[PDB]
């Protein structure tokens, strides 16, 4: 339904209400429904991530299956078995559809080129702390849909946002 020849760049992240997305090299909650949602949006596309986000993935689950994994690093010799390692976004965004999957630093690099954001908001009270990874703050050029709150099996509630721009 989209004519060929374009390069869609999307950002996808899950945040606490505060904007925190990462802490102690991990995501500070677990939400299997967000894992399923993440897999559904990114499946079959290129995924780009920072080196710390690659490191945050358990060895037994990376590279993420069904997707072209791209890792951004300033270390040319970085070992990312099953993934491409790139030194800038200049050649990371060549696929028809690329999803930037974190973390805090890489969202900021890629935001200027993005036309979709898929956000999971988790209703957990985590005030920002020194060294937290934080979500980008979208400006007024973004528009989109806010989903209904839903309870996960753990009792945490969450909701999905789908943002778009030209
Ligand atoms: N809740 C979510 O949705 C979500 C998603 C993803 C990650 N996370 C969490 O976010 C945290 C990690 O995020 P983060 O901001 O600390 O790190 P990150 O963005 O994942 O990775 C940063 C690394 O990327 C490389 N990098 C950054 N800028 C670069 C540039 N201009 N050129 C070349 N390479 C560059 C550098 O790797 P080198 O040091 O190797 O040079 C830098 O250390 C973790 O806690 C993770 O669990 C959360
Ligand atoms: C699911 C976390 C997440 N959610 C959204 N909405 N956006 C993201 N960018 C995002 O991060 C993806 C990178 C971190 O991946 C983690 C971290 C902890 C648990 C599970 C995963 C998924 C990894 C594979 O599902 C198992 O191989
Ligand atoms: Cl996955
Ligand atoms: Cl950050
Ligand atoms: Cl921007």
Joined tokens for residue 13: 């992240």
In 3D space, the residue among 120, 132, 107 whose CA is nearest the CA of residue 31 turns out to be 120
* Cα distances (Å, whole numbers) of residue 71 to 33, 54, 75, 121: 25, 7, 11, 25
13 lines ligand 2 (CB under 6 A): yes
Resolution in A: 1.8
In 3D space, the residue among 73, 68, 100 whose CA is nearest the CA of residue 86 turns out to be 73
Helices (H), 43-101: 51-56
Find out whether 114 and 98 touch, Cβ atoms under 8 Å: no
Annotated binding site for NADP(+): 13-14, 21-26, 50-53, 72-75, 87, 101-106
Q: Counting beta carbons within 10 angstroms of the beta carbon of residue 77, is it exposed (0 to 12), middle (13 to 18) or buried (19 or more)? A: exposed
As a whole number of Å, the end-to-end CA separation of the chain is 17
59 lines ligand 2 (CB under 6 A): no
- Provide the b/e sequence for 48-60 (b: ≥16 CB within 10 Å): bbbbbbbebeeee
In 3D space, the residue among 79, 88, 85, 95 whose CA is nearest the CA of residue 42 turns out to be 95
In a mutational test of the pocket of ligand 2, which residue from 32, 57, 99, 162 has the highest number of ligand atoms less than 8 Å from its CB?
57
Find out whether 100 and 110 touch, Cβ atoms under 8 Å: yes
Q: What are phi and psi of 126, to 5 degrees?
A: -125, 90
Q: Which H/E stretch holds residue 34? A: helix 32-42
> How far is it, in rounded angstroms, from Cα 43 to Cα 46?
8
106 lines ligand 1 (CB under 6 A): yes
């Amino acid at each position: 339904l989209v004519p060929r020849g374009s390069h869609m760049v999307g950002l996808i992240w899950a945040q606490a209400t505060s904007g925190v997305i990462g802490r102690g090299g991990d995501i500070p909650w677990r939400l299997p429904e967000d894992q399923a949602h993440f897999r559904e949006i990114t499946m079959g596309h290129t995924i780009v991530m920072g080196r710390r986000t690659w490191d945050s993935l358990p060895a037994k689950v990376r590279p993420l299956p069904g997707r072209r994994n791209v890792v951004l690093s300033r270390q040319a010799d970085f070992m990312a078995s099953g993934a491409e390692v790139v030194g800038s976004l200049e050649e990371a965004l060549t696929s028809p559809e690329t999803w930037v999957i974190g973390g805090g630093q890489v969202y900021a690099l890629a935001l200027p080129y993005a036309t979709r954001c898929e956000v999971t908001e988790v209703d957990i009270g985590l005030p920002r702390e020194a060294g937290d990874a934080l979500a980008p703050v979208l400006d007024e050029t973004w528009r989109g849909e806010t989903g209904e709150w839903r309870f996960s099996r753990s009792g945490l509630r969450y909701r999905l946002y789908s943002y778009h721009r030209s």
